[PDB]
Structure formats: C-alpha cells, structure tokens
Amino acid sequence: NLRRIMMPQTWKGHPLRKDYPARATEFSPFELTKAKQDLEMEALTFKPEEWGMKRGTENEDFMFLNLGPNHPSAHGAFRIVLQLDGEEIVDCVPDIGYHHRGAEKMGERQSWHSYIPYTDRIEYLGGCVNEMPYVLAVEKLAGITVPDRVNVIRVMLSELFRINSHLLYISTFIQDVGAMTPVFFAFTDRQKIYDLVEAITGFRMHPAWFRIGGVAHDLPRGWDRLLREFLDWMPKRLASYEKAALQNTILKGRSQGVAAYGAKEALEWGTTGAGLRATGIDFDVRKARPYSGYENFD
Amino acid sequence: MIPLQHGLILAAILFVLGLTGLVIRRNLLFMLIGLEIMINASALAFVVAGSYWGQTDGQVMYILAISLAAAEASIGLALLLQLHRRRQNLNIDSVSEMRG
C-alpha cells in the first residue's frame, strides 16, 4: 500500500524535492472555505476497503473507531483507526503525518547555526538530547574536536533532559493506567530540573543552547548548588513513585504481559531504546558507540 | 379494602396482553418479552390470592414463578443467540421447515 503518509491524500507534488518551495509564504495563505473543509474532511475519512478490512462478519458488525487525533491517550496529533469486534482489536491502522512540520526541508532552508532551534523541536521532551547528534554531525563536517569541559557540559544537560523526559513518561504511563496522582509530583520534580536548566540555558523546554564547537555560554556561578539540590530531592521522590504506583498489583495487572514482543520482533521493526533492551539485547549507543565523552562515566 | 376480584381481573388482563404479544410478534425477542409478561401476570395472580387469604404461600409461589422466569429467559436468550448466529434474523416464521 504505497500511499502518502505525511501529507494528505489530496496533496500535489513531493515536498522534499529541490524544486518544491519550502516556505508557506510561497503559496497562497491558508483559506478554509466550506468546500475545502468538506473536501479535506472527506479525504481524512477512513476507507476500510483501501486497507483490506471488511465491515464485519455475518454475525456482527465491526466498529471503526477514531482513536485520535483528539483523544486523551493519543500523545499528540495522532489517529489510530481501530477495527473493533466488541472491545477486541481485529486490526488497527495508525494514521500519522498530522504533526508534520517539514523539519528536514527546513534543514535545507536554514544555515548550519540557525537550524539548531529546529533540532530542539524534533523530540520536544528531549531538548539538548535532540541538539547533541546535530551538533556532533556538524562538528564532524567542520573538523572540530570539542574540549573535555564541553563534553561534560553536554553530557550533564543531556542527562538532565533524559531525567525530565523519563519523569514525564513514567508519570503519564501511571496516569494512563488509571492512577492520576504521581503526575503532579513528577512535574514538581521536572520543575526542579527546570530550575537548573533555566539557570544554565535561559529556557525551559527548547534551550537551543548547544553550539557548533561548544555551548552558548559558560556555566553560571552557582549551578552546582542547583544540581546538588535536585540530586538530593530526586531519589526519595522516585522511591515514593515506585512504592505507591509501580508496585501496585492493579498497575502490574494492567501492564505485565501486555503488548509483549521478543528480540526478533524488536529487530525486525527497528525498535530501539527501552523496548529493545527489554527484549534482552544489550544495545545502548552510549556504550556501543560512545560519543561526547560518555566513556569517562561509569 | 381492595376486592380480590379486582386483583384477579388485573392479573388476567396482564396475562391476556402478554399472550397477545406472544402470538402477534414475529421477532423472537418480543415473544420472550410476552412470555415474561405472562409469567409475571400469573405470579401477580398468586400474590393477590396469597394476600386475600393472609398466607405466605402466595409470595412463595411468586418466588418459584420468578425463578422459572429467570431460567426460562436465560434459555430463551441462548436460543435467540443461536437463531441470530445461524440465520442472521430473528423472524420466528423462518424456523418452520418441519411440517406435516
């Protein structure tokens, strides 16, 4: 099924081609009319015959349900079309491209320096983690070997944002399972991280603080106080989350054995990160292909 | 000071209404509903008779009546499921191929 996946079905042209214009201001401004609204809403409507799905069996009908783009459990602009036999999922079609920002096309549209804030918004809970591979690849293009203090600063900001992202992930998993309390405390922990991150970079979510050849500024005086405060604050909070929610047997009954796959399924789908290592394959980039001085940390 | 004849007449009216619903409806679900009306009307008649005589036997017979009604509705719903699964319709005139 070779259909469009980032653009709507009634899209003309192929935007990553060099002769396709990048900017929206090259084209007419967006004019939503009644005819256009009906046309793109028809184009967004799921057609089960185009995906090889029937409307039901002889005994019962399948319910085709839009799980998104506006659903509390869809993590953004994201639709899964569920073919439902009762509550069983016969099949699903994940419909993506609702969050397409043209970021690669923008990469061809900004200078090497002015593209860094766009790298921040690729994975918007990642921050400096998203900045790191871009600045390292540009530094390979530039022939730059950054000093040791740059490596440690970048590692520290990356690990702070990894803790930020993991806090949001764990608390939202607990919220999706049904327990809504730990998200309040976990976002307080995120605010402690943001105290340090705001002090260092001047911004919360998208610091845009890594540079080709280093970072934008030196560390401000008193950063170690904020880091020490967060490192004292975090572990008791994490132990409280574990005991209160992650060791609850109802959460375990909601999560253990659910949506399980092995090493073969992880490898054949390109699954990386915690899913791949949950299959038992010990593959982390910071150990297998060390970067940014991660080999100097235990 | 409710007359016994008035309660019996009310039960008889509900009984003949349920019987009419059982006869005139082709859908098996409405036939089961009419059967429920019939057994509930008979149980009401037993309650009226027990209340006239001042005896617990009317409500005891009522309890046995609704136990039968519950088990009969259970079996009828299972059979209606089989009819829907094997015919895709609940028309009771369709299941008539034994005759003569």
Added chain:
Amino acid sequence: WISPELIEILLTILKAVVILLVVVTCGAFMSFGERRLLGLFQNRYGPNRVGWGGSLQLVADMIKMFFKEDWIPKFSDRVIFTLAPMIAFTSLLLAFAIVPVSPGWVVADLNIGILFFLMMAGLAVYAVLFAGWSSNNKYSLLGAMRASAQTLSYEVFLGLSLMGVVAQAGSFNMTDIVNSQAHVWNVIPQFFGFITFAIAGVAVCHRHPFDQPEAEQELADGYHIEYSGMKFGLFFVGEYIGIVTISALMVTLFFGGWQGPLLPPFIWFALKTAFFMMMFILIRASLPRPRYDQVMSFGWKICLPLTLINLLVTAAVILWQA
C-alpha cells in the same frame, strides 16, 4: 388545623425536606470538596480564589452550568437522552430516603430498607445504559457496554454482602440494624461483608477505580460525551449524591450509624459519613484502574464466594449463640 397529629405530620414532612435539601447541597459542595481534597492529597491547593477559600467556586460553577448551552443532539433519541440524567439524579437520592441520620430523623422507616437500596441501585444502572445508547456516539455505546459489564461484576454479590448484617439484626429495617450495633459495630463481625460492600458500593456509583463507563483515558469520558450544560451537571451531581448515600449506608450498616459515646448522634453520623466521603476521594486519588474483564473475574470468583461463606459462617455463629 390545630391538632397534635397534623403538626407531627408536618414536622416529619419538614424533616424529610431538610434531609433532601442537605443531601443535594452535600452533593454539590462535595464536587467542590473533591476538588479541594484532591488538591490536599496532591500537595497543592485546588480552587481557593473564588470567594474566601474557594467557597464561591460552587456558585460560579453552578452559574456557568446553568448559562451553558444545554443542548439535545439531532442524532439522539431525545426523550431517553433527557431521561437518563433524571435517573442518575434521582435513584440514589431515593436510596438515601431510608438512611436514619439521627434518632427520629429518617424519611422512610421501611420494613424492606436495604431491599429498597438494592432496588434503587438496580434502577440506577439504567441511567448510564440509556445515556450511552441514546446519544448515538461510539464512545458512549462502548461506555454503556462497559457499565453493563460492571453491573454484572458487582450486583451478583452486593446484597449478599449486606446479608450478614441483615442476619445479625434479624431484620431488613435499618433502625433495627443500627440498634443491633449498640455494643459492637458491624465492621468487627461482618468485616468480609464490609470489604465486599465497599467494593460493590464503589462500583454502584461508577466511581474510580470502577469508572469504566466514563474512562477518560480510554473512552474520552464515555457515556456522557454528548451531554452538556445542566444534564452533564445532573450526571455529576447524581454521582456525588450517590457517594453521599453509599457512605451513609456504610456508616449505618457497618459503623453503628449515629451511635457514639460523647457527641450528639448526628455529629457521630456526620463525622463517619464525612470520613467515608473522604475515603471515596482518597481511593480516587490513590489506586489505579483495573481492566473490566479483571473486575468481572474478581467479582464472580472472589467476592461472591466470600459473601456466601460469610453468610454461612454468620448464621452458624448466630445459631450457636442462640
């Protein structure tokens, strides 16, 4: 019209009206109280700006709910759609009508009592069923099917969990039930009845963790998606009134009702009912939501045999001590 019988009749009528108004007010003010108590349990404040301490937040919400567009969809079965919030508001209010809040303060001293509560719960499921079906929404129909599944889970053992208390009192009447707890509250002998009734009574109100008809994370609030304005407010005011009624019934059946050593009887009744209202809020804040097939398995395989064995053991104890 100067006679002791008539003025006693109007005194009983006035007491019943006062009970009704206080219960409805407690449902609305406990929507506000749920907000404040969830703030307390989550290291925050909740609404504390509109009025002194947020005391006018309920008034602002009521004004907003009244002047919101209360619509009936064109794709919905209009009569059933309008009827479902009425059932949700009235069923467990009528169930409250048998709760003795004080000596001499009860709306209905029925001979059936807890049977009337079971009657009202069995009627109360139809509000969510009708709301899910009539709204012609896919998420709402899924919520209605989940609500029916939940009813299958708890209604098989709710009355049986109350039957040990009924056996000890020898009567269905609730005043006799609180009089049988003159020496020991029923939470001590009927402890297994207490925990099974707690589970089933949380499931009666479709409260978390048994909020599967209205599961926000799965069904995007489920059966009441198409409701707005005062019909939506009717659903939640009925839910909070149901919390009040279930807490008061738990106090009446397992915690002596109004009986206590020092305080006036209504003070004891209100303190225990407030404690169990807070426990409703706390279990909403504390524990996660199980899958509804797991809830059905728990109700049929654990709770129902527990209630049957509890009734057998209670009867053996009663006949041994007689």
Added chain:
Amino acid sequence: MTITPQNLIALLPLLIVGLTVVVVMLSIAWRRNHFLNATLSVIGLNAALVSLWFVGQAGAMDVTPLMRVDGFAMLYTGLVLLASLATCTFAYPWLEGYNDNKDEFYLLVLIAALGGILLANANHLASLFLGIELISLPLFGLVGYAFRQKRSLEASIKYTILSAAASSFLLFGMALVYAQSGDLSFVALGKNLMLNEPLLLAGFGLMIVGLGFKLSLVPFHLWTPDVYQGAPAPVSTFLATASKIAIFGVVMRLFLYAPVGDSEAIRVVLAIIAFASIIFGNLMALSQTNIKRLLGYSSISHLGYLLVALIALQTGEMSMEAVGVYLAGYLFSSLGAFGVVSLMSSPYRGPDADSLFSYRGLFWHRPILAAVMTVMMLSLAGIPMTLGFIGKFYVLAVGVQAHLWWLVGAVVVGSAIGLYYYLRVAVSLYLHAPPSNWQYSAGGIVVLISALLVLVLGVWPQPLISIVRLAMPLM
C-alpha cells in the same frame, strides 16, 4: 412440620439423583471425561433404583406438605428411572460422534429425572409446578443439544416457547384455584364447597391447558411431531417416555385426591379431549413417512387411551391399576422403538435416520433390530401376545365398567387406524432395500430386553398385574 430421618429415608431417590447431579457436575469441572461422567450418571440412577427397596421398607407417609411417598410414587419413580437409564445408554453411542462437549447431556438427563421423581411424589400445587419445570427446562437443553443442526434448533425453540406458554397457563390456573380454595394441597381443592364453582373450574381448565400441552393432548398437541423429529433420538426416547409418564402420574394423583375430580363438567371436558386425542393422533399418523413424527402422533393417541382410563377414576376402582399396567407396557414399547431409532442414528453424523426408506429392508443388515422394532409396532398397535394389548384391554375394561361408550368406540376406531400405520412400518422392515463397541451392544441389549419383556408380559401378564396392584397410594 419438619423432615424426620424416616422422611429422609423416603426421600432417597431424590437425594441420590441430586447428589449425583452435583457429583457429575463437579467431575465435569475437574475434567471432561465422557466415559466417566456417563458411568457416574448411570451409577447414580441405578443407586436410586435400588434405593427404592429401602423406600418401600420405610412405608407410605407425608414428607412436608409438598410430598407424599406411597407405592404409587415408588412405581412412577421406578418408571422414570428406567427411562432415564435407557436414555443414558442410548445417548453414549450417539454422543460418541458429537464433536462438542458431551458431558452436559447426562447432567440435563439427571435433572430431568429429578423432576420426574418429584412429580411421582408430588402432593402439592407447588410440587406439581416445580416438577413440571424441572422436567421441562433440561429438555429445552436436551432437545437442542445438537443446535448446530436446523431441526434440533427448531425443535428446541418450539418446545421452549410453547412450554413457557404452557407453564404460564398452568401457573395462572393454579393461582385461580388457590384464590378459590385457600390451600395448595391436593386434598383441599374443593373442600370448602356445589362443587362447580366457576373460579375453581376456570383454574382447573387453565391447568388442563398446561398439562395437556405436556401430555400432547388435543388441541395442545401440535408441537409433538415437530419436537419428536427435531430432537436427538435418545432425547426423543426420554421425551416420549419419562416426561409423559411422570406428568400423567401427577395428573392421576391430582384427580384422585382433589374433590373437584368428581365434577361432571371436568369429566366431560376430559372426555372430549380424550376422544379427539385418540381419533386425531391415529388419523394424523396414517400418511407419515418419518418414523419420529409417526411415533409422536402415536404418543398423542396413547395418551388419549390413558386419559380414557383417567376419566373413570372416580367411578370404578380398576382405573389406577389400568394406568399402571398401561404405562409399564407403553414405556417398554416406546423404549424399544425409540431405541432402535437411536441405535440406527448412532454415532451422530448430523441428520438422524428417521425416514421410513432408511428402515425399509432393515432385516437384511440388522435382523435383531428389525425383530425388536416389529415387536414394538405390534405392541403399540395393541395386538395380543404383546403388553400393549394388555394395556388396551385394561383401558377397554375400565371404559366398559364406567359406561363410557363413546370412548370405547373411539378406542376401537383408533385401534383400527393404528393397525394400518403400525403394520405398514412393521412390514416395511422386511422388504428389500436398494457399532463394534460394548456401549452400542448395551443399547442393543436394552432394546432386546424391552422386546422380550413386551412379548413375555403380553403372554403372561400376571406378575405385572400383581406389581401394579401392590403399588397402591394412600386413599
């Protein structure tokens, strides 16, 4: 009143059948074992059958207001237990070809047998109602046991809907009778009466509607060929023997004990029903090419003959022993006929062998089954040297003693019509047509023993006469 240990001793077949229901169901829950669960069911039924001896040693007395145990209850309990044991024996080789679960069959047979025993001991309107439903509902399951077929599902739906309607009729009639009388006991139905009170008569009429549905009596008879043909053949064996025998026994007890049994209007209505039942059941079986439908119309006619014996219950004194002898003979002949049908339909392969072209020429491959089936056709025809003639002779003697000349002439005419279609089947067995397991052999032994008993007690009926005359209730 309470339950004495002596009352528990009189309750022995009911207790044993209930205990074996629980045991068989728990064994099913432990592990599905067709052989073991069939064996446990037949062991429980045999244990009840041999506990009848201790019930007889106990004596005849009342167990609660609901039950009364006497020799009559012993005889009808033995009849329904024999019918259930034969049904299980026929069911095993049939169920060996069943792909779905087979163990629930014996559970339903046991619960229906429990209902039959309760109807044997029933002394109350509550007992009669409960026994009727305890027989009927497991038969809703059993008739539609092979629900993957058209005919079994059709027969299940018809039997379920119509039996629910008949139960509603019977319950409303019971309620009207209770409103008139104030007592649900059998002896008090007409004690306070002048016996033709309109509400008592209407209540007994609605009970007659329900009970005549259960006995396939005209005009509540139209279900019978459909449900007999649609049901599995061992289920047809049980439905023809045990249900009819138990319900007619409780009808006999009710009409013997209630003072409204002597009313003339009820007797005339029953006479009309018996006349129409005999004539209509014989006439409708004339042109039947299906053996199951033919046996259904046959059952209508034979229940008409039994009804003739019941009409003369208040007049003479031979009516109850006539019903006992007739029911023993009819049980054995129906067991043989429906068992030959079951053994020809075993193992289950979808549609059973019920066409007469299937049984045409049966002697050239199954000679013993052909001999058994022709003995049963002779017995159901009421031909001398068969037990069916002894039953017909008892019915005729009872009718002549009470001067029921219309019913006597009806019996003669219906017997001639029956002669036609029964002899057609019996001689079609011997024309020219164009297993290997011990349970199938047990079914063959059962139908052969039934045939030998029919022949021997047709030639020498006196032991059956003495047994039935011993089985006397409390006057």
Added chain:
Amino acid sequence: STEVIAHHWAFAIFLIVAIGLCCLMLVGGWFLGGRARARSKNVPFESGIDSVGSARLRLSAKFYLVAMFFVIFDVEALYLFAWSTSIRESGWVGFVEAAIFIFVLLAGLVYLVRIGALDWTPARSRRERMN
C-alpha cells in the same frame, strides 16, 4: 397509627420534591444562556474526523454468557435474602437447608469457572508472556 402516616407523607413529599427539583434544574438549564450555530455542530464527536458508519450497529458484547449467569445468580441471591432475615426462627434445620442450597450454588459457580464459561478475554490480552 400517626408516625407511620407521617412517614408515608414524608416519603411522598421527599420523592415529589426530588423529582420536581430535577425537572426545575433541567428547565433552568434549557432556557438560560445562548445557543451555538455551526455547520458540523450536530455531528457526533469522534475525535475530530468523520465516522465510518455510526453507533447504530450490531456490536457484539463478549460477556453475554455472564449476563445470563447473572440473572440466574440474582434469583439464587433472593432465596438467600429470604433466609437471612429469619435465621433464628428457622434454626439449625434451616441452616442445613441453606448450606445445601449454597453448596449447590457454589458447585455451579465452580463448574462455570472451570469450563471457561466465565472467560471472555482475547488470547493476546490474557497476559501469559511475562518476564
């Protein structure tokens, strides 16, 4: 007496005022405030995109067997409700009767559980594959 008829009147007024208050709040919600007009206002909410079909469909529930069993078990529960209010009067003989009744109930429940009649979870949701 007089307290009984006072409580009857109190129950009647309680029900009347409760239903009237619900109706009054419904009427006040209906008449107050403005109304919204939109092209797609009277379209059912399905996360912002048109439906495939509608909510009027043969949606097959999986717990229907449990629904039949629930009806049966509720009738058994009422038998126990009748027993529990008169335990002292029925004595130990009534206890033996209810013990037999409850044992038959529990044996039926065990039979239903063991034959898989109470299981309707799909195989991928049975959570067999765990670490």
Added chain:
Amino acid sequence: MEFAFYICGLIAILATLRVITHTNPVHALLYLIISLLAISGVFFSLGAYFAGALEIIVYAGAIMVLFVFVVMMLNLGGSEIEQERQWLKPQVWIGPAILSAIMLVVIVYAILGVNDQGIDGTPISAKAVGITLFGPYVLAVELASMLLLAGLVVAFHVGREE
C-alpha cells in the same frame, strides 16, 4: 392503599399494552421496566412487601441483560424499526384480538362469581416468607436450586460461539 393499587394497575396495563404494540426494542424495554415497577407498586399496595421488592430487584437486572442483547443484535437505526413495522398489519393483530378478548371475558366471568371479602392489605413480612420458605417449603428451595442449575447448564451449552 386502594389509590396506589388502582393507579399502579392502570399504569401496568397501559405500559404492557404499549410493550406488545411497540416497534423500537429499547423503548419496549423501557415500557416493560415501567410496567414491572407498576406491578411492584401493586404488590406493595396489597401488603406483599417482599414480592414487590424482589420484583424491582430481579427485573432491573433481567431487563439489563435484555438491553445487552438488544444492543448486540437488534439496534441498527431505522432498519429494524421499518422491518418490525412492516411485520405489524391491521389483520395480523385483529386476528388474535378477539381471541384474547373472549379469553379475558370468560376468565373475568369466572372471577366475578367468586366469594370476595376484600383484601385488607395487612403486610405479610419477608421474615414470615422466609420462615415458610425454609419450613414447609424446604424441598421447593432445593429443587429450585436444581432448576436454576439446569438453566445454567442449558445456557452454557447453547449460548456459546465455537
């Protein structure tokens, strides 16, 4: 007492007549709920308090199962309404109408001749019903347990998928 009896009986008659001549199955189930509530009110007016309580208690659960089955099979919009409305004709109901009417006439004529002192409506308690149920009616209780067991087994065997 008579006020409640007559009004509840009238409501039950009207709601049952609405049930048997209705096209929408969910609406028919709602009218069945109303009729059974009215019959329970009739039970309460006669002093049969236990029977009225059990009437509301076990039919609220039972009609919930009927709603489950109606949602599973019948509800499709206007398709099942059009099919059911076409199944009902003036001839199809006028046929059994006189049959039910003359059955009611004969039953009512038999009723009107009975001796009637009136139902005083003295309450017969649930305790007395429990004493009778586990006293003279012990075998009724145990064989009713066996009857419900048979219903369970039949429902399991028939109402399955594979």
